[PDB]
Amino acid sequence: STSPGLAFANLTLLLDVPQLPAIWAVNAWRELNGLFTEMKTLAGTSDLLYPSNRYNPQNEKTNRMGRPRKYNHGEWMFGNSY
Amino acid sequence: PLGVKGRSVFAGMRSFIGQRLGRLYDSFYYSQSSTKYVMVFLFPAGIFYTRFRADTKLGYHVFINEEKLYPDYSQNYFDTKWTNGRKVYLDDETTVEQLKAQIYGGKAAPENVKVACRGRVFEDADNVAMAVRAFCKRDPRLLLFQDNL
Amino acid sequence: IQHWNKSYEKQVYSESVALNRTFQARNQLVLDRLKPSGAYRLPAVDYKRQLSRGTLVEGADFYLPTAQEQQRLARHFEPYSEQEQEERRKFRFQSISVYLAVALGASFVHDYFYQRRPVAWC
Amino acid sequence: SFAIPPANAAALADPLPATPTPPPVFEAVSSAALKNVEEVSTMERYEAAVYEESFKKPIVCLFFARFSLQSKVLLQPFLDFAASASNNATFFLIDCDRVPRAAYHARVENVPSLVVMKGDDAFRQTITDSVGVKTAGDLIQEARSALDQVLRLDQQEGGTKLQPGVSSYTHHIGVDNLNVYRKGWPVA
Amino acid sequence: FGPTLPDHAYYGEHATYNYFVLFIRGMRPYLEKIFGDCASTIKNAAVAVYRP
Amino acid sequence: QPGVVDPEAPQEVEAFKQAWHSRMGKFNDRSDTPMLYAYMNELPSWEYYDLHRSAFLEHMTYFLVRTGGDFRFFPEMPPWQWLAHMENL
Amino acid sequence: RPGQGSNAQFQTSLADKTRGLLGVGFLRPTKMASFAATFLLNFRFYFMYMARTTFQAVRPLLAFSVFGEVMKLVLATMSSGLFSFLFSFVLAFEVFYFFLQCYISYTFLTMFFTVLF
Numbered sequence: 001s002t003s004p005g006l007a008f009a010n011l012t013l014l015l016d017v018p019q020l021p022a023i024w025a026v027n028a029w030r031e032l033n034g035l036f037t038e039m040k041t042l043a044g045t046s047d048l049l050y051p052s053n054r055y056n057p058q059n060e061k062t063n064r065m066g067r068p069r070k071y072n073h074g075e076w077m078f079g080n081s082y
Numbered sequence: 083p084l085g086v087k088g089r090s091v092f093a094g095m096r097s098f099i100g101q102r103l104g105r106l107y108d109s110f111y112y113s114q115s116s117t118k119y120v121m122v123f124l125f126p127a128g129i130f131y132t133r134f135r136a137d138t139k140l141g142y143h144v145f146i147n148e149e150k151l152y153p154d155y156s157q158n159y160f161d162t163k164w165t166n167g168r169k170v171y172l173d174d175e176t177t178v179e180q181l182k183a184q185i186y187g188g189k190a191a192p193e194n195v196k197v198a199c200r201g202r203v204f205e206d207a208d209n210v211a212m213a214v215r216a217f218c219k220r221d222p223r224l225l226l227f228q229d230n231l
Numbered sequence: 232i233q234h235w236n237k238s239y240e241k242q243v244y245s246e247s248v249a250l251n252r253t254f255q256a257r258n259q260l261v262l263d264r265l266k267p268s269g270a271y272r273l274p275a276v277d278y279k280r281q282l283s284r285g286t287l288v289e290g291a292d293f294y295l296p297t298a299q300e301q302q303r304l305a306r307h308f309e310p311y312s313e314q315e316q317e318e319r320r321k322f323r324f325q326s327i328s329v330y331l332a333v334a335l336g337a338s339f340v341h342d343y344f345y346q347r348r349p350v351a352w353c
Numbered sequence: 354s355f356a357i358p359p360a361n362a363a364a365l366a367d368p369l370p371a372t373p374t375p376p377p378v379f380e381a382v383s384s385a386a387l388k389n390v391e392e393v394s395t396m397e398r399y400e401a402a403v404y405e406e407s408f409k410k411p412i413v414c415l416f417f418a419r420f421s422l423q424s425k426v427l428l429q430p431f432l433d434f435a436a437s438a439s440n441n442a443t444f445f446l447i448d449c450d451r452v453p454r455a456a457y458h459a460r461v462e463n464v465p466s467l468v469v470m471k472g473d474d475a476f477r478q479t480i481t482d483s484v485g486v487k488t489a490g491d492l493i494q495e496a497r498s499a500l501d502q503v504l505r506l507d508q509q510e511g512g513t514k515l516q517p518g519v520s521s522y523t524h525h526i527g528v529d530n531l532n533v534y535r536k537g538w539p540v541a
Numbered sequence: 542f543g544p545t546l547p548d549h550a551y552y553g554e555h556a557t558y559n560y561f562v563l564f565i566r567g568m569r570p571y572l573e574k575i576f577g578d579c580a581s582t583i584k585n586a587a588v589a590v591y592r593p
Numbered sequence: 594q595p596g597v598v599d600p601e602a603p604q605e606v607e608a609f610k611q612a613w614h615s616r617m618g619k620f621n622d623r624s625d626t627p628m629l630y631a632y633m634n635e636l637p638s639w640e641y642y643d644l645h646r647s648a649f650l651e652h653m654t655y656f657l658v659r660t661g662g663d664f665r666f667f668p669e670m671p672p673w674q675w676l677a678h679m680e681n682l
Numbered sequence: 683r684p685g686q687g688s689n690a691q692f693q694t695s696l697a698d699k700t701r702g703l704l705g706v707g708f709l710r711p712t713k714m715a716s717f718a719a720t721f722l723l724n725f726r727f728y729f730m731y732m733a734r735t736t737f738q739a740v741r742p743l744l745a746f747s748v749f750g751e752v753m754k755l756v757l758a759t760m761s762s763g764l765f766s767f768l769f770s771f772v773l774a775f776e777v778f779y780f781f782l783q784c785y786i787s788y789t790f791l792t793m794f795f796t797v798l799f
């Protein structure tokens with residue numbers, strides 16, 4: 001059964017084996033988010049997307065750090081400024 | 083005699099899963115109501131929520147400079163006072179204004195309140211995640227202070 | 232005293248009747264519908280009931296799968312077939328050569344494929 | 354600490370002794386083999402049945418006891434049901450005190466009890482009245498329904514879909530530990 | 542209101558003839574087949590590589 | 594298995610049996626040093642009847658009368674119908 | 683019918699059946715909360731056991747290391763012959779004490795790592 005010398009393993013099991021479903025769920029959610037990101041990239045984007053990055057806020061009116069783009073009021077002959 | 087002709091290993095798997103599920107239902111039925119519901123739904127659910135929130139979202143330890151800037155939590159229950167060092171989980175789209183409103187309970191906040199991390203002031207129209215990434219990488223301790231100067 | 236205690240008993244029994252009615256209702260509504268069939272019941276009987284039946288056995292923490300292995304101590308003349316004897320004669324000692332070879336291979340793999348760490352270069 | 358004394362001469366004595374029979378006057382009352390069933394009196398016969406005939410074609414076993422009046426009431430209609438459906442299944446008549454290991458095997462807790470078996474774990478349906486509301490007719494109707502169900506399932510899916518379950522690896526050892534001897538496992 | 546639970550709901554299983562040991566002794570043949578096939582495949586590959 | 598010359602001896606067999614029984618008892622039995630007896634709100638049949646001898650008598654007389662039978666067929670858990678009838682009586 | 687006489691007494695009210703569906707005197711959320719509290723409080727035994735186990739495991743290490751450091755201080759400080767003659771016996775006593783601590787630890791560890799099943 002068990003014993004005082006197995007307290008380490010008992011505690012570890014009781015506190016960790018219930019977390020394995022959540023760990024697997026987190027892994028699956030990460031896979032799905034990656035799939036959606038890749039589908040969006042294939043569809044097309046104005047500015048690029050960093051796949052393995054936490055957040056990608058860049059758009060036509062926003063930098064890759066969440067700030068407004070400088071020198072973006074007018075239009076440019078070569079198209080997008082990026 | 084292993085296996086039978088005409089039957090498939092997938093059918094065997096299905097039968098085994100059915101047996102397991104029926105046995106689980108029987109064992110749950112013939113059990114104490116005081117323990118089974120808790121141990122099977124409430125601890126798993128809470129553990130799942132906590133682990134998912136920790137491993138998916140990103141949190142920040144919030145502090146406030148002065149006591150006069152503390153919010154009014156006298157009405158809401160289970161928290162009748164502000165404590166500095168509070169862990170706050172946010173979404174990647176959250177801004178400084180949204181954070182301030184969440185802190186002050188959607189009520190009138192003091193004047194000229196601003197957020198800083200490692201001594202560096204954030205703009206109110208800035209994403210918290212990216213601002214932290216830039217100024218305090220892997221040190222999300224935020225401070226709310228009053229910028230009169 | 233007398234009257235109050237007897238009325239206490241009477242109200243206790245009223246509460247008992249209420250509890251019994253709700254018990255009947257709970258059962259015949261929920262439990263008679265959710266009751267398992269019995270096909271997936273527990274495939275065992277408690278050791279106390281087995282002991283009362285005179286059926287309990289305690290021994291053989293181990294087992295012998297094959298009858299060839301079960302009847303060895305009873306045959307008395309051919310515990311092992313000739314082919315089995317010839318096969319057994321190959322394991323009179325442990326193979327330190329095989330031990331050494333496997334240990335060297337495993338150490339090589341573990342050290343130069345699984346336990347590589349960086350080192351400075353000047 | 355828990356213990357039960359081993360046994361007594363009374364417990365080990367013959368559970369089914371003979372009793373005096375009355376003359377042909379007490380039988381005169383207001384309410385006044387079998388060629389279709391098999392009376393079982395040996396666990397050897399019961400195991401032979403359950404392990405070969407139950408795999409060939411289904412079996413229906415009536416577990417009874419002499420003290421029970423429901424068993425006497427149910428005997429005759431069971432014999433009629435046997436005469437009816439003896440072509441599709443086998444029919445056995447077991448006494449719990451004469452062959453207890455057969456009752457422990459079928460997991461019977463009350464008498465009388467019908468047990469429809471096929472494969473020994475593929476389809477085991479037990480019919481009884483643990484409350485005391487049903488009657489012989491209701492029990493026989495439930496038995497007919499169970500026999501119909503098992504026959505339909507056996508015909509379903511080219512004879513398959515009825516395979517033994519836990520008995521494939523348990524050998525009914527948790528139910529009756531004496532099967533270790535049958536399996537040849539040691540007991541030291 | 543009486544007992545609602547059976548004895549096996551509380552009492553521990555047999556010590557030496559338990560559910561898992563019976564299950565694993567029943568699965569032994571399939572596991573032997575599986576692992577023997579895997580080991581034979583690996584050994585045949587290694588031998589085909591080593592002999593030449 | 595022990596490293597004795599004869600593990601199949603009657604002494605070894607009886608020692609193993611006694612150890613078996615003592616282990617099972619120390620694990621399952623209700624004692625002052627309980628292992629498994631814990632978090633008890635709904636008791637099983639055996640412990641229930643061992644602690645409440647009044648109910649064993651009532652539940653037994655009702656079984657013998659409601660169903661003319663032997664104590665050897667005493668059910669593990671009685672039906673709620675029987676319990677309700679007992680309460681009414 | 684056999685059981686109709688008893689089943690006729692089983693006639694419930696609408697409120698009775700609603701109360702049964704809700705499980706008033708059979709779910710006992712107070713009992714569930716008591717169980718949760720007791721189960722969470724029962725985690726102190728693991729900490730007690732691990733503390734005892736670690737102490738009994740490190741006892742010989744302590745006897746071998748810290749008393750050794752003390753002996754080494756004495757050796758580093760002493761120069762004469764009489765004190766050294768007298769200190770040799772202290773060293774031997776430390777040997778015996780180490781073996782005693784090892785025996786004690788062996789006993790307590792075979793007690794703490796003994797499982798019935």
Ligand SMILES: CCCCCCCCCCCCCCCCCC(=O)OC[C@H](COP(=O)([O-])OCC(O)COP(=O)([O-])OC[C@@H](COC(=O)CCCCCCCCCCCCCCCCC)OC(=O)CCCCCCCCCCCCCCCCC)OC(=O)CCCCCCCCCCCCCCCCC
Binds near residue numbers: 109273
């Ligand atoms: C979201 C909300 C979540 C909340 C939950 C919601 C519901 C979800 C389902 C429940 C999930 C929790 C499962 C708990 C079960 C165990 C604990 C318990 O309380 O059980 C008591 C419950 C009642 O038991 P009981 O009342 O005390 O006595 C009755 C016996 O159990 C009756 O026994 P039996 O006679 O009927 O049969 C014997 C039984 C024996 O069960 C037992 O008695 C104990 C089982 C041992 C458990 C721990 C074993 C750990 C072993 C270590 C593994 C080391 C592997 C090393 C490999 C090295 C090789 C490289 O056989 C088994 O079922 C065990 C099989 C698996 C053992 C595998 C071990 C390795 C052997 C491999 C064998 C070959 C594979 C199988 C092939 C089968 C044919 C296809 O047990 C059971 O009902 C059956 C045992 C459980 C079997 C598993 C059932 C499926 C579980 C699925 C888990 C997946 C979760 C992930 C979900 C996805 C999330 C993202």
Ligand SMILES: CCCCCCCCCCCCCCCCCC(=O)OC[C@H](COP(=O)([O-])OCC(O)COP(=O)([O-])OC[C@@H](COC(=O)CCCCCCCCCCCCCCCCC)OC(=O)CCCCCCCCCCCCCCCCC)OC(=O)CCCCCCCCCCCCCCCCC
Binds near residue numbers: 322330338
């Ligand atoms: C790339 C694909 C994936 C990778 C796969 C790579 C290739 C492997 C494929 C799979 C296996 C081969 C398949 C084809 C086989 C075809 C030929 C054939 O059929 O027969 C085999 C073939 C011929 O068999 P045979 O015809 O019956 O005749 C055999 C001879 O008569 C001789 O019989 P014997 O009775 O005389 O046995 C000789 C034995 C002699 O007996 C002994 O084993 C005594 C010594 C045991 C040492 C302690 C064992 C600890 C085990 C830990 C294992 C895990 C360690 C972690 C792994 C990484 C280690 C760095 O020596 C050994 O061979 C065993 C060596 C064990 C490894 C040594 C590990 C280091 C020990 C360190 C101890 C010192 C500690 C202090 C260090 C400080 C030093 C300053 O010989 C073998 O290959 C033997 C297989 C060796 C397997 C290991 C022994 C079993 C131990 C089990 C340990 C637990 C493992 C758990 C497994 C995973 C969980 C399920």
Ligand SMILES: CCCCCCCCCCCCCCCCCC(=O)OC[C@H](COP(=O)([O-])OCC(O)COP(=O)([O-])OC[C@@H](COC(=O)CCCCCCCCCCCCCCCCC)OC(=O)CCCCCCCCCCCCCCCCC)OC(=O)CCCCCCCCCCCCCCCCC
Binds near residue numbers: 344
């Ligand atoms: C007294 C005893 C006498 C002894 C005599 C000795 C003299 C005899 C000559 C042999 C001398 C021993 C040579 C040992 C290896 C070289 C030394 C060494 O280990 O340096 C470390 C060095 C470590 O690499 P690293 O980049 O610095 O860092 C490693 C980290 O793991 C990197 O970290 P990471 O995170 O990037 O992980 C990447 C990892 C990722 O790995 C993985 O993710 C999984 C690995 C694969 C698992 C299996 C998955 C299944 C898919 C693969 C299927 C393979 C089976 C085929 C299946 C066919 C069906 C589709 O990638 C790999 O490590 C690839 C490993 C390549 C293994 C495959 C090569 C064949 C293996 C069999 C060779 C047999 C030689 C026997 C020699 C005779 C000894 C008696 O090794 C290498 O650079 C790679 C070795 C490339 C092979 C070179 C082979 C030529 C040299 C040997 C000459 C003889 C060739 C004979 C060929 C026979 C036909 C096969």
Ligand SMILES: CCCCCCCCCCCCCCCCCC(=O)OC[C@H](COP(=O)([O-])OCC[N+](C)(C)C)OC(=O)CCCCCCCCCCCCCCCCC
Binds near residue numbers: 093571
């Ligand atoms: C992948 C890493 C695994 C490494 C660790 C595990 C050990 C490695 C060895 C393989 C593990 C699996 C061994 C299975 C042995 C059982 C064989 C057997 O015959 O069992 C009886 C079953 C039931 O048979 P049956 O009852 O239908 O018919 C035969 C009846 N008898 C036995 C009486 C003759 O047979 C099978 O159908 C095969 C089952 C094994 C195949 C599935 C593997 C199980 C492991 C996965 C568990 C999850 C199941 C759900 C999967 C869903 C997939 C989408």
Ligand SMILES: CCCCCCCCCCCCCCCCCC(=O)OC[C@H](COP(=O)([O-])OCC[N+](C)(C)C)OC(=O)CCCCCCCCCCCCCCCCC
Binds near residue numbers: 106117122551630632
């Ligand atoms: C490398 C890792 C190696 C480690 C192995 C890792 C894998 C295996 C780890 C297993 C060890 C942990 C197992 C602990 C299991 C404890 C959980 C448990 O038994 O529950 C407590 C309850 C407690 O019951 P109890 O309270 O009556 O009795 C428990 C014990 N005593 C008597 C001492 C109190 O157990 C059960 O009764 C049910 C268990 C089976 C059900 C399991 C959950 C799934 C349920 C799904 C069915 C849902 C039906 C819903 C229907 C609703 C309407 C009715």
Ligand SMILES: CCCCCCCCCCCCCCCCCC(=O)OC[C@H](COP(=O)([O-])OCC[N+](C)(C)C)OC(=O)CCCCCCCCCCCCCCCCC
Binds near residue numbers: 784785788791792795
């Ligand atoms: C359930 C399991 C219970 C487990 C209980 C565990 C408790 C006991 C654990 C104590 C382990 C201590 C051993 C390590 C310390 C010695 C290190 C060493 O070898 O030095 C190198 C020694 C001494 O070398 P040296 O001093 O001559 O010179 C080189 C030393 N170095 C390398 C360190 C610089 O190597 C030897 O040559 C020793 C050979 C003689 C044999 C010595 C062993 C006996 C002394 C230790 C006994 C301890 C166990 C007592 C158990 C009593 C139980 C009743």
Ligand SMILES: CCCCCCCCCCCCO[C@@H]1O[C@H](CO)[C@@H](O[C@H]2O[C@H](CO)[C@@H](O)[C@H](O)[C@H]2O)[C@H](O)[C@H]1O
Binds near residue numbers: 028
């Ligand atoms: C039966 C199969 C079950 C397999 C497991 C499947 C996963 C189940 C849980 C999915 C949770 C979905 O719910 C969703 O979770 C993610 C992650 O917390 C949240 O999303 C959060 O993280 C992601 C990543 O930055 C962003 O959307 C955003 O930063 C934030 O909102 C959503 O606000 C919430 O709506």
Ligand SMILES: CCCCCCCCCCCCO[C@@H]1O[C@H](CO)[C@@H](O[C@H]2O[C@H](CO)[C@@H](O)[C@H](O)[C@H]2O)[C@H](O)[C@H]1O
Binds near residue numbers: 344346348
């Ligand atoms: C003679 C042929 C015998 C056949 C043997 C084939 C075995 C091949 C298995 C190789 C698996 C190695 O797996 C790999 O191990 C190395 C350590 O060395 C790890 O290496 C890791 O740590 C090192 C050191 O910090 C860094 O280079 C880096 O962070 C990362 O590569 C990898 O994270 C792991 O993926």
